[PDB]
Amino acid sequence: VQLVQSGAEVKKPGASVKVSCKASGYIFSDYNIHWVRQAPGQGLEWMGWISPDSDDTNYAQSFQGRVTMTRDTSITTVYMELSSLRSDDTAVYFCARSVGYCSLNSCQRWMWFDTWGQGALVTVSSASTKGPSVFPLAPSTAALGCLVKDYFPEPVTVSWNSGALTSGVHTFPAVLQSSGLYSLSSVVTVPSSSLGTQTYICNVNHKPSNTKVDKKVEPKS
Amino acid sequence: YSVLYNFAPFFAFKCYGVSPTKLNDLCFTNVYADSFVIRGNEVSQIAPGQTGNIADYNYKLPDDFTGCVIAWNSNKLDSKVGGNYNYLYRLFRKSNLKPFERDISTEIYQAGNKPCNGVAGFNCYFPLRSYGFRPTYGVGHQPYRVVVLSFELLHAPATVCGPKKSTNLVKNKCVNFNFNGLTGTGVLTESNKKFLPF
Amino acid sequence: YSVLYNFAPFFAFKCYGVSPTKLNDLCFTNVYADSFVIRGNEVSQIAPG
Amino acid sequence: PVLTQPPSASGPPGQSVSISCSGSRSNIGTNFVYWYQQLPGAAPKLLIYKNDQRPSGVPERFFGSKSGTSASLAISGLRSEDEVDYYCAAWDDSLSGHVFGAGTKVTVLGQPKAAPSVTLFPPSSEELQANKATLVCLISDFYPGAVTVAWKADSSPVKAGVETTTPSKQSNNKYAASSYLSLTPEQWKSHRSYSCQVTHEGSTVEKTVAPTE
Numbered sequence: 188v189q190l191v192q193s194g195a196e197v198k199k200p201g202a203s204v205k206v207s208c209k210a211s212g213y214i215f216s217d218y219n220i221h222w223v224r225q226a227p228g229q230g231l232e233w234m235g236w237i238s239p240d241s242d243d244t245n246y247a248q249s250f251q252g253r254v255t256m257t258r259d260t261s262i263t264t265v266y267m268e269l270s271s272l273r274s275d276d277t278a279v280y281f282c283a284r285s286v287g288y289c290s291l292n293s294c295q296r297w298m299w300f301d302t303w304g305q306g307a308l309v310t311v312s313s314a315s316t317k318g319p320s321v322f323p324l325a326p327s328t329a330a331l332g333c334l335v336k337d338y339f340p341e342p343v344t345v346s347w348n349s350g351a352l353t354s355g356v357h358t359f360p361a362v363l364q365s366s367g368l369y370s371l372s373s374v375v376t377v378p379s380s381s382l383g384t385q386t387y388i389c390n391v392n393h394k395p396s397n398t399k400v401d402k403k404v405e406p407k408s
Numbered sequence: 409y410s411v412l413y414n415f416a417p418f419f420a421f422k423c424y425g426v427s428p429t430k431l432n433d434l435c436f437t438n439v440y441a442d443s444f445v446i447r448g449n450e451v452s453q454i455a456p457g458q459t460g461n462i463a464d465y466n467y468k469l470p471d472d473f474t475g476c477v478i479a480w481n482s483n484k485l486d487s488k489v490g491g492n493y494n495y496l497y498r499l500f501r502k503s504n505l506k507p508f509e510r511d512i513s514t515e516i517y518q519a520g521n522k523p524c525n526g527v528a529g530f531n532c533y534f535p536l537r538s539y540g541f542r543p544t545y546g547v548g549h550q551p552y553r554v555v556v557l558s559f560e561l562l563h564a565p566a567t568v569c570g571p572k573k574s575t576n577l578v579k580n581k582c583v584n585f586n587f588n589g590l591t592g593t594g595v596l597t598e599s600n601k602k603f604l605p606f
Numbered sequence: 607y608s609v610l611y612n613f614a615p616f617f618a619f620k621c622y623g624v625s626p627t628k629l630n631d632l633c634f635t636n637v638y639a640d641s642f643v644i645r646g647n648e649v650s651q652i653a654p655g
Numbered sequence: 656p657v658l659t660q661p662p663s664a665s666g667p668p669g670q671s672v673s674i675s676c677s678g679s680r681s682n683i684g685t686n687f688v689y690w691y692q693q694l695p696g697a698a699p700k701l702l703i704y705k706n707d708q709r710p711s712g713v714p715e716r717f718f719g720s721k722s723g724t725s726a727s728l729a730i731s732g733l734r735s736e737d738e739v740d741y742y743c744a745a746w747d748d749s750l751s752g753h754v755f756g757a758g759t760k761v762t763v764l765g766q767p768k769a770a771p772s773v774t775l776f777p778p779s780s781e782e783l784q785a786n787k788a789t790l791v792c793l794i795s796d797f798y799p800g801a802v803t804v805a806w807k808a809d810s811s812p813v814k815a816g817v818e819t820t821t822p823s824k825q826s827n828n829k830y831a832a833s834s835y836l837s838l839t840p841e842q843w844k845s846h847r848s849y850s851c852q853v854t855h856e857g858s859t860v861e862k863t864v865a866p867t868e
Contacts, residue, residue: 189698217490223755225693230657230742231755248750281698287493293514295746295753296686297493297538303698322789323779327864330774336789359793359833362820370818370835374774374793407780407868460619499615504627516685519612526684529722531612534685 188212190282194307196395197340199314201271208265208282208304215263216240219285221300222267224278232278236290239265243290250276272311279308313367314339318398319391325406329382330355332374333389333404340395345373347387409570415553418480419451425474426559432570435589439568440558442467445495445539448550451479465498467556470507474561479554483543486551492541495551500535618649658682658743658756667764668733674759675727676743682754688726689744690719691755699742703728730761738763769829771797773851775864778843788840792851795831797822802832805852810845813838 193207208220222234235246239258246254257266265282282304289298322334333345346356355376364370377387389402409431421428446454450462456471463469486492500517517535518524524532541551566588582595607629619626644652659677666672676688688706693699701710703719706726714736719728726745730737743756775792782788794802800822806812816837822830834851843849843866850861 214489217488221753230757231693233750233752233754235752245751247752287491288488289492289494291494292748292751293496293536294493294538296536299689299701299704300691301701305698322781322785324791325777325779325868327774327776327862330776330793332776332791332793334778334789334791357795357825357827357831359825359831360820360823362818362833362835364818364835364837365816370789372776372791372793372833372835374776374795405779407777407866461616500611514685519608526680527723528684529720 190304192282192306194309197312200311221283277311280306316395318393321402323404330376332372336370416480420479423476435566435569437564437567446552446554465501468507475559477556482551493538495539496536662760664761671731673729682745682747686746691742737761783840788843790836792834794853800830802853807852808846
């Protein structure tokens with residue numbers, strides 16, 4: 188059946204990260220396994236292949252010695268490492284399998300990726316982990332937004348009345364700051380008749396640090 | 409030649425030019441061994457005088473070969489539940505391959521007078537095909553542990569033969585002697601024939 | 607005879623008497639073409655004797 | 656290397672669109688080319704391999720075959736099967752490995768234009784006492800996405816620390832731009848008014864919002 192791949196979160200470039208691929212259902216001693224990555228805005232790029240039964244190992248022409256492909260039948264998993272990750276080659280990794288069993292160049296003509304194991308999309312960014320600093324907001328039928336800035340890493344979600352409101356819930360595309368920071372602000376639309384009595388709140392959920400605090404948005408006075 | 413039988417019952421030992429029962433008394437030299445696989449329906453095709461599609465474009469056996477093969481069924485060595493596509497073979501050739509000639513073929517074969525060196529989508533056919541080793545083909549397509557052995561009775565000193573121990577030299581009695589695989593009857597005496605030791 | 611290989615790879619291909627290798631230089635007349643079917647275990651039965 | 660295929664392939668449904676995969680000598684002709692369709696966030700799928708035999712569940716209407724040094728594929732009927740990009744799959748000895756396509760971006764098939772509506776949101780007074788000013792400004796309700804950035808403050812236009820990504824497809828089948836600014840609160844309060852100059856090639860919308868309310 189389908190395969191899985193355990194990844195990591197967004198980390199700083201220039202370090203080492205360990206991934207894994209664990210088989211499910213079948214015995215992981217008969218199937219050739221491949222690797223491939225898809226850059227954002229570009230097609231897939233071939234990596235290489237190993238087999239978890241013998242010492243057959245091949246790489247691409249660009250990453251011949253950058254990574255190390257390890258196998259272990261006892262734990263029934265395959266690990267690879269990524270030393271000194273860049274900001275361009277990081278991509279989603281497919282733990283692709285091919286039927287049969289060979290390691291020959293002429294054998295690759297009759298090898299196709301019959302089923303594709305889903306993987307983890309991994310990215311790299313130089314930063315630690317900190318919570319956003321929530322602040323109120325003033326408007327310009329009107330519209331109001333939520334102020335969340337400097338969140339690490341992606342993503343953070345905001346909603347009005349803890350997701351129980353559907354009045355103009357909008358997802359703006361993410362931007363990148365010039366000082367290596369992240370910032371977003373979703374904007375909803377609310378009529379001015381209901382604003383004069385009750386003003387809604389904004390909720391922010393920073394998963395890596397568990398900072399769940401309720402803020403109040405209110406126009407400047 | 410006695411450790412050879414611990415690798416399951418065989419579909420082989422039909423030997424031409426040599427006795428499979430007597431493999432230790434005779435002595436020879438220059439033994440060459442090659443390893444490949446066979447489908448199963450043409451096990452007897454590895455024989456002198458046989459010429460078809462198998463063993464005509466991959467490994468042609470000469471008529472004067474005076475040797476034989478060993479082969480038995482492979483049910484766990486390389487056959488897997490997911491299949492095995494390791495081995496390939498040559499489909500088309502311009503002529504019959506000469507025996508004892510290793511050859512490589514990757515270029516595109518053509519079946520006409522039109523120019524065709526790497527062009528596909530036409531009558532040009534790839535001369536290679538992938539073996540599918542599956543347990544669902546009991547006799548039709550199955551891996552086999554076939555290995556060919558070649559022997560020749562050349563005028564060379566004997567190197568490889570049976571581990572049978574020698575005896576003490578005896579003179580002045582006509583007996584049968586086995587000197588480096590040479591069989592003869594006569595008396596052994598001191599010889600006055602002295603030549604250059606070459 | 608080179609066009610005959612395009613249909614299918616020949617299974618049996620053995621021949622008695624005339625060689626199946628060299629046939630372009632051979633000249634003859636009045637050949638016979640017959641067709642029938644075989645279960646599979648009597649392919650060798652198509653032989654003299 | 657990378658294969659050469661036209662990425663901007665589109666058209667109304669009911670006709671035939673043909674795409675050709677360019678390649679080298681060893682890539683197409685001496686090997687068997689394949690075709691992979693991939694989905695975002697999920698595993699890809701197989702439609703064509705060895706150009707003559709089809710998988711289980713793959714419709715016959717897909718047509719991909721090779722007739723020379725460059726394989727070609729044709730599509731007919733754009734309802735759901737042509738909503739996401741395809742990949743040209745082949746093998747060669749240039750890098751001793753498999754090669755993948757660059758992505759043939761084909762969607763399903765116009766949409767009327769719309770004048771943008773700028774919504775400038777000045778920062779609250781809580782940032783003023785915290786010595787910060789995170790200026791935020793969102794523009795939506797336009798198609799297609801093509802906007803310019805000009806932070807006009809009616810006194811001195813400064814583009815130091817400007818961040819703006821291209822608009823994409825939103826949930827309301829439209830485009831929405833984003834523009835953020837960070838500056839000292841004193842220079843922000845020095846401006847008597849602020850706006851976000853965005854033009855959809857035919858108008859310059861300007862909303863006058865004062866920081867002093």
